[PDB]
Design a protein around this ligand. Sequence first.
Ligand SMILES: CCCCCCCCCCCCCCCCCC(=O)OC[C@H](CO[C@@H]1O[C@H](CO[C@H]2O[C@H](CO)[C@H](O)[C@H](O)[C@H]2O)[C@H](O)[C@H](O)[C@H]1O)OC(=O)CCCCCCCCCCCCCCCCC
Ligand code: CLA
Ligand code: CLA
Ligand code: CLA
Ligand code: CLA
Ligand code: CLA
Ligand code: CLA
Ligand SMILES: CC1=CCCC(C)(C)[C@H]1/C=C/C(C)=C/C=C/C(C)=C/C=C/C=C(C)/C=C/C=C(C)/C=C/C1=C(C)CCCC1(C)C
Ligand SMILES: CC1=C(C/C=C(\C)CCC[C@H](C)CCC[C@H](C)CCCC(C)C)C(=O)c2ccccc2C1=O
Ligand code: SF4
Ligand code: SF4
Ligand code: SF4
Lengths: 88, 74, 155, 202, 214, 146, 32, 31, 220, 142, 80
Amino acid sequence: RYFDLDDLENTLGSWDMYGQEDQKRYPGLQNEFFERAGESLTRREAIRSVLFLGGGGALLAWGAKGASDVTLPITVGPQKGGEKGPKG
Amino acid sequence: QASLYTHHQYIAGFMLCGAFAHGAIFFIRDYDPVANKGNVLARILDHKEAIISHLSWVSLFLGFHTLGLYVHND
Amino acid sequence: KQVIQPINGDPFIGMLETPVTSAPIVAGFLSNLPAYRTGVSPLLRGVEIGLTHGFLVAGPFIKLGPLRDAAGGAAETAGCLSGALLVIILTACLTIYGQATFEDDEPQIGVKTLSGRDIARDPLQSAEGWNEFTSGWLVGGLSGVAWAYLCTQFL
Amino acid sequence: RPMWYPGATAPKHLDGSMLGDYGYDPLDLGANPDSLAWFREAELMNGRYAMLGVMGGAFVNAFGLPNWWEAGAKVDVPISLGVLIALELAIFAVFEYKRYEGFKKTGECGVLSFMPFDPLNMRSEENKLKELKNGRLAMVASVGFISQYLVTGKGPVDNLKDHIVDPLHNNIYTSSVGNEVTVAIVFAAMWPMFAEAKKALG
Amino acid sequence: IRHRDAIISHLNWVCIFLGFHSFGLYIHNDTMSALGRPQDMFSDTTIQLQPIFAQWIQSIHYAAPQLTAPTASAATSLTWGGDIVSVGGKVAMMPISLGTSDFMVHHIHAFTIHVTALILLKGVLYSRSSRLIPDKANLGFRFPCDGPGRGGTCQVSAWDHVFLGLFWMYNSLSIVIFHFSWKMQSDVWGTVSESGVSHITGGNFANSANAING
Amino acid sequence: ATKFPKFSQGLAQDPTTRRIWFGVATAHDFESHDSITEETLYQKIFASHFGQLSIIFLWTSGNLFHVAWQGNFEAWVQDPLHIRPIAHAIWDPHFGQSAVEAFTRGGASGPVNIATSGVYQWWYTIGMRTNQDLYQGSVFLSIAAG
Amino acid sequence: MNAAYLPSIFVPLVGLVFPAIAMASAFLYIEK
Amino acid sequence: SISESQIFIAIFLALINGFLALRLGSTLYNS
Amino acid sequence: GDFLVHHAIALGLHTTTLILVKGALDARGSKLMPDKKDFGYSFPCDGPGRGGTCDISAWDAFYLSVFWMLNTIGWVTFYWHWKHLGIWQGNVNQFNESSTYLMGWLRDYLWLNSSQLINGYNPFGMNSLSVWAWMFLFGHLVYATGFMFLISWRGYWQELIETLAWAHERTPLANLVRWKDKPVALSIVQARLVGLAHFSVGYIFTYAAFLIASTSGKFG
Amino acid sequence: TPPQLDPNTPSPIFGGSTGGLLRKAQVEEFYVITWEAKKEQIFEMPTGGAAIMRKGPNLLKLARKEQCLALTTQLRTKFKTDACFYRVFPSGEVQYLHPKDGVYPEKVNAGREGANQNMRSIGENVNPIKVKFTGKIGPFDV
Amino acid sequence: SHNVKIYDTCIGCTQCVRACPTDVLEMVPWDGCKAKQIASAPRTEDCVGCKRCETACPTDFLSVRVYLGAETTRSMGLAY
Ligand SMILES: CCCCCCCCCCCCCCCCCC(=O)OC[C@H](CO[C@@H]1O[C@H](CO[C@H]2O[C@H](CO)[C@H](O)[C@H](O)[C@H]2O)[C@H](O)[C@H](O)[C@H]1O)OC(=O)CCCCCCCCCCCCCCCCC
Ligand code: CLA
Ligand code: CLA
Ligand code: CLA
Ligand code: CLA
Ligand code: CLA
Ligand code: CLA
Ligand SMILES: CC1=CCCC(C)(C)[C@H]1/C=C/C(C)=C/C=C/C(C)=C/C=C/C=C(C)/C=C/C=C(C)/C=C/C1=C(C)CCCC1(C)C
Ligand SMILES: CC1=C(C/C=C(\C)CCC[C@H](C)CCC[C@H](C)CCCC(C)C)C(=O)c2ccccc2C1=O
Ligand code: SF4
Ligand code: SF4
Ligand code: SF4
């Protein structure tokens, strides 16, 4: 027998298992520096898009620019002699 | 040539298999037996089996005998 | 006696408690993690959680990357840069999961503790609590790879 | 409401409320999914810091000729690497930390109430468009000074005199991207009609 | 029957685990070949993945007829660290060496043997009734779908998990053989050539087959 | 209808992912939507043909443009039998020194695909004989499709 | 060919960037 | 041998064929 | 050899039509289920009643045609290729001799052509056909994937997802991250459609690689 | 007469199993069974495993109406007891499902006014043209 | 929600109503029948689509024909 139908919260076993009560266990010495470093980007579509538009541009940038390419047909690549078929 | 001749055979295959599908979507939806009573479309539906049965003979004839010869030759 | 029981009374709930579910150790450990606590800001978790996952992800790249031979330490930065991408990619994923599940208007859907007590729902549910976490993840995620590099060229 | 002469309709997002508004919002960015007037400062700070930009590269061709692209190259000042950058790092952030963190908290007028920097404030806020308007114009020339080096390479004024000497033969339309621009000019002539045919023909 | 959702779930994870690790490592080896970068493909010259334990086992048994097997003529069999044996100019049995390509295969044996356990166990535990079909027992051992409803029940019965198990049995064992047959031709069989002991395939396995390439 | 399959409310409300799968595959069927009158059914169709018809032209302008740019033409025009027609170059970030070289077969510098499409002769038997002609021609189909 | 630096600019943009954006935006539109 | 100048002209010309589709696909889906 | 093949070709055209001509005429109805006019066009079945209807619809009828379409075209494109190969290679005797019995098709046309293709990825080095050597494998793996959808039907997978949506749901650290759209084993018809896509995509890429890289390897 | 509320009837003895409620129950409806007992004995549980029913009126919580009638067909045809069940969902209100008329549907009662009937034989249905672009779910509606 | 509709042909055998695992079909009394009884489907909500109905109809061509509609939380029979 269980019931307490007045509460459907305890009938579902939905209880959060490993969630604790304890408040912040973290030091104020390092608190006040990060807590103000996170909200510089708080916003939905004007920031996530910065990651797509501005963030993914290093594929563009250092894919073309920096000469660290390894065996890339981009840059170093073909430098050796080209293969010719039997017929032509 | 090879890369072509095969292209236009396959791309011709799919198009016919779609010619019959929309042939079915026709009959399943926008065909009307009333206004078509006695037409040429209704005469075909009047004998379904004859068409179905004879294609079933020709496809079996070629089935046994064409395979039956390759196996005999093997 | 019998060691194994259904979770906390009712047998008809899906899971049932076992030594890796309800124990002295496992109850405490999984609860100590910067995950389940209800008493710390979500911004502070991302700067914790993401801070770790940058360091350990660098390793595979900075060790077994495409280019594992360089005389300038470039084999190490080639992994740092790419390991810094899964930092930048997952930020897109994290933030995306916020605009989907959580509506700014809808309240926190988290449930209430383990036993008898209803304690204030997970401060991270809605987009506000979530987005503060995402930027937090991005703050730490950059550090983890960074200190991984510093630990590569030093220490 | 001159409003860049598309014809009549501007989107509602730009009505002429904010200063300088000609109601041009092609990409629907002038909307407010987060804010808009944040763009105004972003325009303005760009604009402000831009309009003062030309002055450095402008006059240097006219005087001693270490022109801007070659300017930051040759000097004796920078002292053993980091001292060259490291000094310039702090002083901006420390005051920008104030105005950036402050004026998205202390109110949305970027250094307008001017509490950090007190001007003579004789003219003050009415003509403020004119500031914004005079810099936006210098913004566009600033792009040119790039291509002045890229396409030609001569100094901005050394390009001017060539246009003064031979007005017909110094155009972009001859050199390089001339073939490219003259197409972007054509496709910009029909541009107002396509935008207008939405309204009229719809 | 009561915790069954735990058993099946974990086994279902073990397969996906081996799916990418066991099999996928060939796809790496396949691809890194075709891109002209042999330095990468897991192999003997390249990245070493060797069956430590299995190799280490063969060490004991060739050291066995010393102390752990004091009364013997010699070790039990020659697949351990023994020496070659000939008859009629043929190799009776020589030893077998376990290299990287031997490593990668056993995990494919493991991959198939797990996946085919998933299917049969799931057939037993969900034979009675599953979470989606509570009556399933009353429909018999062998039945087609219940409905087209519920997105369709097609092939839910416990006769039908044996249907599926036979394609994984077939697959599992078939590769058990191709491992055998061409390991045994590579590293054992063939005529005794005196010098060279040339095998049937000339001893190409650990080099020959790493990727699905070969 | 709010959610993704805007055109059918039976899919529009589904808790599962079948809303997603059918939403893609039920799209182009215009006889089934919320309310599709006889008139507005012909509309989207006749608009769609402009889609297919424009997509084709760009696809052709690509073939022309690439052969005009990344491929050899003049060199082939001189020796149709003894040299291979080339298609777009092979850009992969993923190669070794060998596979780059081994694919540079052709007249060009980089790795390229010998083109088995066959389009390359139908230009010459119509006749062009400059990369300019191909580019000149590859612009129209870009324009015309517009 | 004279344009040679283009593929390095486009292919990453069209093989990754566009599939990154069209992965995000097409997702956010599945649920509204 | 194609002049580098022509190339960007074409790419910009095909850039317009990208917007006219976006303008179409909107108006068609907007219906 | 020319004679015997044209009957296979002729066979393939009939059994393809036989399927499609059936699906059209039985779209309206047949003796088993004469509701199909009003039951929709593409529907999974009428349920396991009165003999267990399956593939009873007219979409499932079309569905079966593709598998024959890919033969009767496969037979053609084969028979076209290897009559020409001999003619490009200067000999009419490879075909009309060995074309009669089915082993030459396997023993001569398939065995000789495969030697050049498989040497692309060869551990000794990359040939210029290494492009096609890989894809020819990509062609099978898709074809082989296609059987997982065609053979294994839904109810098995729907009980499997149940176990996973239970595990992800009650596992720690993944409690916090959940799905909006409840995952479900995809629909009956949806699989066959997905199944026949893999079957074809795999059926094409192998023969597209074999054909090109046989005539690119030899050059007729 | 027919409807009833939810008094306190205990739950049958069982030791827990992975079959049972899930995170539907939090946001979504779930069912409840109430029957009675005479002797105590064991019954198949449809969510898996076996459970001991008490000596008297009992109450269960299942996850599906489907699972629910599996257990009524169980006890009605085997131990020959009646059962009736409910629909409970988190907003707090409960509905009475199952013989809403007070009689099992298998047997006739009066007062039932049935829906979804057609007065035509099947062959007498409309063919899909005659509902075209006007629209209905199918030829059977019209 | 699935659609289920019933026809003149019913013998009133109840053999449908015994089949439905969700107890949709419910026997409504009637007149013209031999046994003077007709089924009916008050809940189209909970028809899962099993078509265990259509198997049970002793009638030559069915008295019930289930027409599958869209599929909800219930009509998918989800425990998730
Ligand atoms: C061309 C692709 C583009 C280029 C390639 C891009 C990569 C492709 C990535 C795949 C992207 C699409 C994936 C689709 C998967 C979903 C398929 C599905 O579940 O789709 C199944 C749908 C489900 O059917 C529809 O299902 C509907 C479901 O009902 C819905 O619709 C009803 C109708 O109103 C109501 O709205 C109701 O509320 C709602 O439930 C209805 O039943 C419709 O009547 C019924 O038609 O079926 C259909 O309609 C069938 C329509 C498909 C017919 C075409 C099949 C051809 C087979 C391919 C041929 C082989 C090709 C190989 C090529 C190899 C060479 C390269
Ligand atoms: C110009 C030709 C043409 C036109 C206009 C149509 C138009 C139509 N057809 Mg149709 N069809 C055609 C040709 C055509 N078809 C051909 C050639 C075939 C045979 C293959 C078919 C077979 C067919 C069937 C079987 C069905 C239709 C249906 C439909 C209708 C809806 C289509 C739909 O929902 O697609 C929406 C878009 C999709 C479903 C895209 C799915 C992608 C497919 C599966 C291909 C995936 C493979 C891919 C290419 C692989 C990529 C390879 C790469 C990864 C390497 C619509 C009226 C359906 C209908 O009306 O039902 C009521 C239907 O059931 N057609
Ligand atoms: C190689 C495989 C294969 C073969 C041989 C067939 C054969 C056939 N299919 Mg089929 N089919 C196949 C694959 C195959 N299919 C696949 C993969 C699909 C996709 C699902 C289909 C889909 C399909 C459809 C949809 C249809 C067919 C049809 C047919 C028949 C066409 C007529 C014909 O050629 O008869 C030739 C018959 C044979 C060659 C049988 C050979 C057996 C010998 C002659 C007798 C037995 C030998 C020996 C005595 C056995 C001893 C056993 C031992 C116990 C003593 C035929 C029975 C059509 C049909 O019904 O035709 C009427 C039809 O509608 N099939
Ligand atoms: C070649 C065909 C093929 C393949 C690849 C599979 C694959 C699979 N089957 Mg299987 N199956 C097949 C045929 C096949 N089947 C057939 C013909 C049948 C008929 C009997 C079945 C019947 C069957 C059953 C009954 C079961 C499976 C199961 C499985 C899964 C085991 C887990 C696993 O290995 O995942 C790992 C994935 C791989 C090994 C695929 C390799 C691909 C590479 C490594 C990853 C690609 C990287 C990246 C994502 C590339 C994409 C990027 C791109 C989008 C840009 C797996 C998805 C079992 C399952 O799901 O439970 C575990 C299961 O119960 N199948
Ligand atoms: C790890 C394996 C791998 C990977 C990742 C790549 C990656 C690539 N190869 Mg490649 N290659 C490989 C192995 C690999 N290769 C091997 C082993 C060989 C043999 C030696 C080659 C030979 C080779 C050649 C010869 C060429 C490439 C090319 C390419 C590039 C094509 C990219 C592109 O245009 O995307 C676009 C990709 C597609 C359009 C096809 C995918 C279809 C998608 C996935 C279906 C989805 C459709 C649906 C509507 C969803 C829409 C998606 C949405 C995001 C828009 C890309 C960089 C090409 C290149 O560099 O220039 C183009 C080229 O010509 N490769
Ligand atoms: C549909 C035709 C088509 C196809 C299949 C390709 C295929 C390819 N092009 Mg391409 N191209 C085309 C037309 C086409 N081109 C046209 C008309 C132009 C003139 C602007 C170009 C200009 C161009 C350049 C400058 C380059 C390529 C390159 C490439 C290769 C890598 C993919 C890439 O970077 O594309 C990127 C291409 C663009 C951004 C141009 C716009 C896209 C064109 C118009 C095709 C759009 C059709 C498509 C269905 C649109 C749907 C998009 C979305 C809804 C899915 C690949 C072989 C690269 C290459 O050769 O490196 C090896 C490269 O550097 N293309
Ligand atoms: C057009 C498609 C495309 C392109 C351009 C690339 C490009 C690359 N791949 Mg890749 N890949 C692709 C498709 C593609 N891939 C697909 C489809 C698969 C799955 C089948 C893979 C699987 C794969 C693997 C498994 C690996 C690669 C690797 C690589 C890198 C080659 C090795 C190297 O020099 O790294 C050296 C790289 C650097 C020195 C720096 C790169 C960092 C850039 C400049 C920063 C990017 C910024 C941006 C935030 C990135 C996120 C994008 C997103 C946010 C929009 C190169 C960046 C290797 C790699 O990443 O290792 C490093 C590697 O191990 N690929
Ligand atoms: C099933 C379906 C749904 C409902 C309506 C719909 C009509 C679509 C119906 C039909 C669908 C389809 C695709 C039906 C037919 C398809 C096919 C295979 C059509 C092919 C017909 C072939 C024909 C004539 C050939 C006729 C004769 C020819 C060339 C030869 C002529 C000649 C000979 C033999 C020697 C040379 C000189 C000369 C005199 C010209
Ligand atoms: C494997 C399998 C599944 C499980 C397969 C699933 C759930 C597909 C999902 C796999 C991942 C999540 C997606 C695969 C990645 C694709 C590349 C996605 C393509 C996306 C485009 C369509 C846009 C079924 O649901 C099924 C149903 C009926 C008959 C046979 C089968 C069957 O064989
Ligand atoms: S498989 Fe699909 S069709 Fe064949 S019985 Fe099961 S449900 Fe009916
Ligand atoms: S429907 Fe079929 S079974 Fe149900 S009562 Fe009428 S006749 Fe008897
Ligand atoms: S199909 Fe719908 S109606 Fe027929 S039995 Fe199953 S649930 Fe009751």
